[PDB]
Amino acid sequence: MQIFVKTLTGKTITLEVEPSDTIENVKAKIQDKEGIPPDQQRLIFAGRQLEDGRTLSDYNIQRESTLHLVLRLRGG
Amino acid sequence: MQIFVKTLTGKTITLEVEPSDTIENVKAKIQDKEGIPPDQQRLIFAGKQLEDGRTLSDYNIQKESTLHLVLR
Amino acid sequence: MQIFVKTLTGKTITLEVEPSDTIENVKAKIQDKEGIPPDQQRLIFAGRQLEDGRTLSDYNIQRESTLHLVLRLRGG
């Protein structure tokens, strides 16, 4: 299935994932589409930050759901 | 000065701050107005997480700037 | 009738008003006599702030009444 990742700066990114994929999995896929390293990504759904390890089905993220993406830059 | 704090769930909050206010000071002001403990607050400006120990002027946050708040 | 709008620095503004005059009208009268814009005016009577939509008679402001003027120094 496909999820929609929208940055708070206005960029929308469509990704290819599956319910068994962890949050660390989608972070590695965003690194492909946009080049953001996984250690500097934070994914938001329902106003809460998503944890590396728990899956998309674990957070009740269904098909065509919207995720939010922020940067975590130390020194930034 | 007056800044705006928006959640991604809908609520918009107005805050009275100073340029020399630190990020943790803004979080304590958010806890006062909202009840959210600063432990679970993440402030966002220009698309990136804001660090504790920095000030609002350090990120060039000025009058009527919009910060975003997400729960950790 | 006459009312007296005094500042916290002793400046007394004598205004010729009517009991049916609204607080906005009083502020516009102050702006004419002195030049203080209305949005910069906080008007106090009997220790409480006066609302724009009310009239003078609404606050039992009779003749020879003394009002107090505090400046709203917050610009934009």
Author numbering:
A (entry chain B), C (entry chain C): 1 to 76
B (entry chain A): 1 to 72
Task: Quote from the publication.
Sophisticated mass spectrometry (MS) studies have revealed that a substantial number of K48 and K63 linkages coexist in branched heterotypic chains and these K48–K63-branched Ub chains have been connected to nuclear factor κB (NF-κB) signaling and proteasomal degradation. We engineer a K48–K63 branch-specific nanobody and reveal the molecular basis of its specificity in crystal structures of nanobody-branched Ub chain complexes.
In this K48–K63-branched Ub3 structure, the K48-linked Ub adopts a closed conformation with interactions between the two I44 patches of the distal and proximal moieties, while the K63-linked Ub adopts an open, extended conformation. Previous approaches to generate branched Ub3 used a Ub moiety lacking the C-terminal glycine residues (UbΔC).
